[PDB]
Amino acid sequence: LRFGYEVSFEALDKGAIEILGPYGISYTFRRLAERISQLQSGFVYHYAFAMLLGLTLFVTFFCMWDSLSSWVDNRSSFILIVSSFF
Amino acid sequence: LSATTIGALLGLGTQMYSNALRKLPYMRHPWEHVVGMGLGAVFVNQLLKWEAQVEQDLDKMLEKAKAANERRYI
């Protein structure tokens, strides 16, 4: 009887499964969407800056790709991106 | 079902959908419903004819691509 509520339901069904399922996913996606929406600050300077970073990243990672690939790894680049995203 | 009657039903449904979309009665302006059935019938007939024509053109273009790839070989 204790397993029915203390473990199966509260600790698993309403616990780890839900915390790592719809609940935590909902909270993380809410905060991530909010943070993404913070980028659209309504500033022409911010938009021009985003354009400039886009152009510079494209140039660096495609035109200079020989030296860039000789130096950095794709795994390391994506890991740094994710770490920046926390 | 025939193409003409399918088109007539489609046109009548579209006209009554438009009427109900403005909170009007379904059969307001029945002459518009007749015009809609005629337009739907002609639209379906022309769509079928144009589909046959474009299918023939696509078969011709597929044959052209097949010949172009066949010209690869020595």
Binding site: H46, F49, D73, S77, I79, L80, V82, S84 | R72
Partner: protein
């Protein structure tokens, strides 16, 4: 193929990873500092703003270099210990970098587990494939050369 390309002794691999992490962190810190506005009282002065920008540059560069170095070092040590390279070889290294470096930054175990899991999944996700955008090599994409048969 990737292993066959270059020798890349593990110590040099770790140094290269740390250096490129430092460079990327410096760039990201500069970007963030220039993106975020200065306070109203700091608008008249420029030296405090430059100092804040430099501090953000240093912080981001140091943390990114630490993350990259720890990840590459753990991956290399695991490869040396197991005498083979697999999916989990670099997957564990990603978790260690997030748990130790990013976990210390957040000053919480939950962030270390959350950041470590995200890095481990990202490292394994890329390593799951051949680290290639397109996995099809049989398609021609262009007819240029004639063949006998």
């Amino acid at each position: 193929r990737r292993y066959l390309e270059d020798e890349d002794t593990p110590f040099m691999k770790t140094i290269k990873g740390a250096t490129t992490g430092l460079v990327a962190g410096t760039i990201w810190g500069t970007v963030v500092a220039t993106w975020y506005d200065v306070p109203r009282v700091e608008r008249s002065v420029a030296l405090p703003g430059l100092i804040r920008t430099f501090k953000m540059m240093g912080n981001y560069g140091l943390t990114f270099a630490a993350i990259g170095g720890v990840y590459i070092g753990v991956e290399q040590l695991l490869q040396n210990y197991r005498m083979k390279r697999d999916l989990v070889n670099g997957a564990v290294g990603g978790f260690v970098a997030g748990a130790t470096i990013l976990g210390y930054k957040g000053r919480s175990i939950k962030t270390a587990l959350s950041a470590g899991s995200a890095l481990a999944f990202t490292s394994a996700y890329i390593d799951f494939g051949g680290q290639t955008l397109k996995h099809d090599e049989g398609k021609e994409y262009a007819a240029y050369t004639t063949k006998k048969r």
